[PDB]
Amino acid sequence: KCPPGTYRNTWFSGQLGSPFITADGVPVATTLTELGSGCSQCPPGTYAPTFGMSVCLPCPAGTFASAPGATACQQCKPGTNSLMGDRTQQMALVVTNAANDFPALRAYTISGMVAGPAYAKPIVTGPDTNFFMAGKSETCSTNLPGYYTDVDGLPIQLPCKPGTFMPFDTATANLLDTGLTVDGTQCYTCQTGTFNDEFSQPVCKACWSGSFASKRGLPTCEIAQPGTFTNVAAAANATFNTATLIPTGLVKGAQAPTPCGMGYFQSSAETTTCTACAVGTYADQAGLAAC
Amino acid sequence: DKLGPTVNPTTSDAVTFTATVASPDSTTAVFFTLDYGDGVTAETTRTTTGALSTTPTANLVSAGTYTVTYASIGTKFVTLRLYDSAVAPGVLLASKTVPIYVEDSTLTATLLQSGVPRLNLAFSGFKGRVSSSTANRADMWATIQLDTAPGVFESSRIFIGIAPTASTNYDFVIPDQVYNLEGAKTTVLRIYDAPVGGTLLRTFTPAAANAVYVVDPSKYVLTLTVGPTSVTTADQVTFTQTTTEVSYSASATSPILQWRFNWDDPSVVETPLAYPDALTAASNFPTTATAVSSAAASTFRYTSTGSKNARLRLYDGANNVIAEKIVVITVSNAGYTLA
Amino acid sequence: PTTPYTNIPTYFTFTLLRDPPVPPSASSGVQFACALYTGQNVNPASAPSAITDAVYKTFTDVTTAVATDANYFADQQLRVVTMAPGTGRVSCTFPTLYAAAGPFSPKFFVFEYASSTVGANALAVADTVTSLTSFTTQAAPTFITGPTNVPQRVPLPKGFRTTCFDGYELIFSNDNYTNGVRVAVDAYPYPVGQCRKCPGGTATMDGYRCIPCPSGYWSNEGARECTACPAGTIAKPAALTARAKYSIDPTTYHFVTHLAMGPESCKKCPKGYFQPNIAGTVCLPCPSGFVSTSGATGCTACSEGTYHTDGVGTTTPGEATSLDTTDTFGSIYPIIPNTCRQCPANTYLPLRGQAAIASMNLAAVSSATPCRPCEDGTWSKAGAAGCQ
């Protein structure tokens, strides 16, 4: 029988490994084998625990095997995850090699609101063409900004739950306290004056002026109750540039209720400005719902 | 190979053969004979060849009478055999065999594509008729094959049914299949008698511009430009049918898709499904921008003061849109004041 | 092989050969005292004073050691191992803990052990040391090497699914996948976990990996267990080619070259080869004399008065056609002779199934037929089993 870690098929020998290390993006006709038997070595991305088998089976999800002669697959690191291609390659929208078109796989397809005043449903358009987890013929790829991976073994990268946001890198962030660094594996809670009503969000949107938010990690904005107002200028959700699919320019809204001053009321909730009390009626204390 | 009809031959038609012979080693003369699957029909004699050499020589059936009409339908093993001398038995140098499938003329098979198969997306709008001329027919299987390209392979065996009685048509459902070429295809619906192997009974053909064409919905670009947006319920929005240009911009030869526009207001039903301007049915969709209608101008007033999604979408066959362009229009009633 | 990891407790194994003078099976066991010094000065302070075997052979009795004796990792340790009779090779095992990184030089010595005493150098000549290659310990990478893990009770928005079910491998895509065929594209705002069917040749249970079958079997796109190929068949995986543009839906992974897509892949053996097994990864050439028929399960013995050579002169030979081998398989199964021939007049075959002996060079030694001169005073009427 063939030794473990190798194989031999009558219909095909040889290894085609690492098709995302070469710049072109094509496999290599590897023919390495163990001398004594001559059985063909397992292609990078598979393994062979048993002694005798013809086809040696792909690496399962959440695992990897860079070396051809792999006895078994290793669980990806706590931070990173398993997904064909590297992060930048998965994050690349432009192409260089026209013929192969290899470094152009568009795996992100992020929901974020497009550059400019428009708001286009996911910026990258078209079917995801490169999606397999199992085939992993290289080091474990780092995690898409929206998602995260807590434990070592994880088939698919998990999205950050509502009221949380995992930025792309530590420096390329918007609102992070300067005593922490995003290593991927742990998802940081949204800062006061933000909302996040969906998963896999690389940064949570700042609440529109009317509604405000006080506590940390709030899945929805808190309604400005009648008797106050919320004025703020820089309260604009970040603008995902199409060049690198990264958000930027987020500024938080009003953290406090900031009640309506004396002689000034607000009957209607979810309001930015405060209305003056009419003639004949008075406002005795600040924060009065009505006159 | 079979030099006769490109389609798998039926009993009547009778086939011709091409068989070039070459010899990179030596340039001598040999004599060839042709056995047929039904050896009763004919047993050819030994005829002389010339020179041969590395280059292939147009030989065998040039103006010969080796064409044989078969009787039974099935797989027949034609056998070329080369001999050194022209005496029995001689010395057989080589013997190449070739299988030739002969189908049944009685059975008919037709393929219907309901809608235009989109790219990537799975297209289920297929259907197959099998009208048998015989009274009783046995159980039958079919195999869809999307294209004749080497990369695409024949699908699994589907059990279409029995077609037990009469000469009536028996529809069979075809399971979903995914295309990826965004170009013209050559769809082949083969039919077998048994589940595994057996024999070929019919092979359908796209047949001259009824071919499955793959369409990318992304390529289509449609402009709407219909009046203002912020106007109120009083103001009438104007649909300028001449200004709404629809274009494919991918390839010249694409199927036509009738358009249809909706106000998204319950007051008025959706527009009737019609073709682009100055274009008839069963023609190529225009690659350049063209209006939906020649001379039209609609005026609409929204009853309710809400957000209205004026949407124009292209249908074909089944009501499965491939290209939709929506535009939002807002309505306000608080601008008015009287004193 | 040269350099071990820094802080992992490394086992060291030394193979000792007694060479052709292997102690006889009928004898008593022999013992040897393999002793080594790693090079580090973590344990008993200083390094050994000299290289001579005298000091080396008195390091410590370490043959028995519990993991928590504080001596389980001694820089210099001597153990005693035994060769049982009837074996020449011995393995000596020493655990070694390297606290810090740096160049080290392990010095290994071997001594014949007899009656609790340590002897001289077991190698020829006294005071010869097998110095191991001086290495520098590298960092120890952490990597658990088990199967896939699964997270318990994590919140997912709508479609995202941690674990797909039988016959559907896991995908990470925005597009609206139903079953394994997709319905709509670019529906979910972000990409999420879907399930694909898996192509024909493959078959998946508990699906994260979508595994092609072993050569013996054949599969259909969405089956749990990959289907066995019939007895008299091969299941030749049809060449799959590849994807050329990296913007085309991939059938399967990239290392996958061929797949056994559907029952049609189970082609049947040509005449002259039988396939008894059910896996049937390669067809079995029928042995000398025995003769097959089409895809055969068992070779039929050739009758008496007959041998086994080609049958080109005879009519209706059971030879493999060029179609059945070149077109379906190629060059792996050439055309071998398959038929029975009658030996001519005045010779006879009493036994059954003796084929014609061949020759691999013709101009040197000619091949003949294994029938007999038919002892004098007797004749035979062409193919016969007994001379009259």
Q: Cβ separation of A156 and C249 shorter than 8 Å? A: no
Tell the residue number behind the tokens 């705002």, with chain if given: C189
Omega of the bond leading into B89 within 30 degrees of 0 (cis) = yes
User: Å from C320 to nearest chain B CA?
Assistant: 11
Answer whether B218 touches A (CB < 8 Å).
Answer: yes
Residues in chain A within 8 Å Cβ distance of B218: 125-126
CA atoms within 13 A on the CB side of B266: 3
Cβ neighbours around B228 below 10 Å, total: 11
Verify whether the Cβ–Cβ distance B178 to C185 is below 8 Å.
no
- The token duo for A167 is 């930025």
Distance from CA of C221 to the nearest CA of B (A): 9
- CA-to-CA distance for B218 and C210, rounded, in angstroms? 31
Q: What's the rounded Cα separation, in Å, for the pair A225 and A204?
A: 23
Kindly identify which residue of chain C lies nearest to residue B182, measuring between CA atoms.
C248
Show the CA angle centred on residue C194, arms to residues B311 and B177, nearest 5°: 70
E strands, chain B, are 31-35, 47-48, 74-83, 92-102, 108-113, 126-131, 140-145, 158-161, 171-173, 188-192, 200-203, 221-222, 237-240, 245-247, 259-262, 290-291, 297-300, 308-316, 318-329
Q: Which residues face B142 on adjacent strands?
A: B158, B191
Instruction: Please name the amino acid found at residue A36.
Output: G
Coil/strand/helix, residue A35: coil
Other Cβ atoms less than 10 A from the Cβ of B75: the count is: 13
Amino acid at C281: T
**CB of B10 closer than 8 Å to CB of B64:** no
**Cα angle B334-B335-B338, degrees, rounded to a multiple of 5:** 95
Cα–Cα distance measured from residue A175 to residue A195, given in angstroms and rounded to the nearest whole number: 13
Does A280 contact chain B (CB < 8 Å)?
Answer: no
Write down which chains contact chain A via at least 3 CB pairs under 8 A.
B, C
How close is the nearest chain A Cα to the Cα of B216, in Å?
10
| CA distances, A52 to each of A2, A9, A40, A49, A191 (Å) | 5, 11, 12, 9, 56
How far is residue C180's CA from residue C194's CA, in Å, rounded to a whole number?
A: 8
Neighbouring C-beta atoms of residue C17, cutoff 10 Å: 9
Q: How do beta strands B245-247 and B290-291 pair?
A: antiparallel
In B, residues 47-66, which contact C (CB 8 Å cutoff)?
none
With a CB cutoff of 8 Å and minimum separation 6, the contacts of C364 are none
For chain A, the straight-line distance linking the first and the last C-alpha, in angstroms and rounded, comes to 92
Which residues of chain C come before a gap where C and the next N are over 2.5 Å apart? none
d(C-alpha C60, C-alpha C131), whole Å? 20
Three-class secondary structure of residue A112 per DSSP: coil
Task: Say yes or no for a CB contact (<8 Å) between B153 and C322.
Answer: no
Question: Which residues of chain A lie closer than 8 angstroms to C249, CB-CB?
Answer: 127, 129
- Check B218 against A127: CB less than 8 A apart: no
Query: Using CB atoms and an 8 Å cut-off, which of residues 75-94 of chain B contact chain C?
Result: 77, 89, 92
Give CA–CA dist A108/A200, Å, rounded: 11
A127 and B CB contact within 8 Å: yes
CA distances from A149 to A61, A109, A206, C141 (A): 13, 19, 25, 19
Is the separation of the CB atoms in B118 and B314 below 8 Å? no
Chain C residues with CB under 8 Å of A59 CB are 209
Cβ-defined contact of A125 to B120 (cutoff 8 Å): no
End-to-end Cα distance, chain C: 76
- Categorise residue A242: left if φ over 0, alpha if ψ from -120 to 50, beta otherwise: alpha
Contacts of A93 in chain C (CB under 8 A): none
How far A267 CA lies from chain C's nearest CA (Å)?
A: 37
Contacts A124 to B, Cβ<8 Å = none
Instruction: Provide the number of CB pairs (under 8 Å) joining chain A to chain C.
Output: 188
Is C129 in contact with C158 (CB distance < 8 Å)?
no
**Which residues from C are below 8 Å from A25, CB to CB?**
246
Long-range pairs for C72-76: beta carbons < 8 A, 24 or more residues apart: C73/C9, C73/C43, C73/C97, C74/C43, C74/C44, C75/C37, C75/C38, C75/C39, C75/C40, C75/C41, C75/C42, C75/C43, C75/C44, C76/C35, C76/C36, C76/C37, C76/C38, C76/C43, C76/C44, C76/C48
CA distance A32 to C374: 58
In degrees, to the nearest 5, what angle opens at C-alpha C337 toward C-alphas C335 and C340?
155
Amino acid residing at B337: T
Q: C292: distance to nearest CA of chain B, Å? A: 20
Q: Which chain C residues touch B95 with a CB distance below 8 Å?
A: 322
Q: How far apart are CA A79 and CA B130, in angstroms?
A: 58
Q: Tell me the residue length of chain B.
A: 339
Distance from CA of C253 to the nearest CA of A (A): 6
Question: Computed from CA positions of residues A16, A19, A21, A22, in that sequence, does the dihedral angle turn out positive or negative?
Answer: positive
Method: cryo-EM
Chain centre distance of CA C384:
49
Token pair, residue B6, equals: 């490109």
- From CA C237, how far away is CA C235, in angstroms rounded? 6
Q: Name the minimum distance, in Å, from the CA of C314 to any CA of chain A.
A: 35
DSSP A286: T
Question: Among all residues of chain B, which has the CA nearest to that of C263?
Answer: B196
Beta bridge partners of B79: B35, B97
Whether residue B120 and residue A127 make contact (CB cut-off 8 A), yes or no, is yes
CB C219 within 8 A of CB C202: yes
Chain A, 126 to 145: residues with Cβ < 8 Å from chain C are: 126-135, 137
Contact C119, C58 (CB under 8 A): no
Q: In this complex, do C321 and B153 lie within 8 Å of one another by their Cβ atoms?
A: no
All residues of chain B having their beta carbon less than 8 Å from the beta carbon of residue C322 are 95-97
* Partners of residue A109 in chain B, C-beta under 8 Å: none
Using the Cβ of A117 and the Cβ atoms of chain B, whether some distance falls under 8 Å is answered with no
Beta pairing class for B74-83 and B31-35 = antiparallel
Q: The tokens 């039958």 sit on which residue? A: B140
CA dihedral B314, B318, B320, B321 (to 10 degrees): 0
Distance from C-alpha of B189 to C-alpha of B203, rounded to nearest angstrom: 6
Query: C300: helix, coil or strand?
Result: strand
Which of B153, B178, B180 lies nearest to residue C261, judging by beta carbons? B153
In this complex, is the C-beta atom of B324 within 8 Å of any C-beta atom belonging to chain C? no
Distance from CA of A160 to the nearest CA of B (A): 29
Measure in Å the smallest separation between the Cα of C294 and chain B Cα atoms: 15
Q: Which of residues 11-50 of B touch C (CB under 8 A)?
A: none
Amino acid at C13: T
CB-CB under 8 Å, C248 with B180: yes
Q: Under an 8 A CB cutoff, do A109 and C237 touch? A: no
The reply to whether C382 touches chain B by the CB within 8 Å rule is no
Distance from CA of A123 to the nearest CA of B (A): 14
For C135-238, where are the alpha helices, taking DSSP H only? none
Give resolution in angstroms.
3.9
Q: Shortest CA distance to C179 belongs to which of C162, C192, C166?
A: C166
Q: Does B165 touch chain A (CB under 8 A)?
A: no
Closest by CA to C165, choosing from C194, C207, C196, is C207
Q: Is residue A3 within 8 Å of A39, Cβ to Cβ? A: yes
Residues near C357 by beta carbon (within 8 Å), at least 6 away in sequence: C367, C368, C370
* Residues in chain B whose C lies over 2.5 Å from the next residue's N (breaks after): none
With an 8 Å Cβ cutoff, is C184 touching chain B? yes
Which chain B positions have a beta carbon within 8 Å of A125's beta carbon?
Answer: 218
Alpha-carbon span B232 to C215, nearest angstrom: 71
Rounded CA gap, A170 and A174, in Å? 10
Buried b (16+ CB within 10 A) or exposed e, B181-214: bbeebebbbbbbbeeeeebbbbbbebeeeeebbb
Output the six-digit token pair for A60.
């399962």
Say whether A125 and B218 touch across the interface (CB within 8 A): yes
B176:C181 CB<8 A:
yes
* Range 83-112 of A in CB contact (< 8 A) with B: none
Contacts of A127 in chain B (CB under 8 A): 120
- Nearest Cα of chain C lies from the Cα of B285 at a distance, in angstroms, of 24
Q: How many residues does chain C have?
A: 388
- Interface partners of chain B (CB pairs < 8 Å, 3 or more) are A, C
What's the Cα-to-Cα distance from C121 to each of C34, C115, C127, C128, C285, rounded to whole Å? 10, 16, 6, 7, 58
Alpha carbon distance A34, A29 (integer Å): 16
Residues 303-322 of C with CB under 8 A from B: 312-313, 321-322
Residues 194-253 of C with CB under 8 A from B: 200, 220-221, 238, 241, 248-249
Nearest to C238 among B98, B121, B153 (CB): B153
Provide the β-strand partners of residue C96: C10
| Tokens representing residue A95 in the block | 């192409």
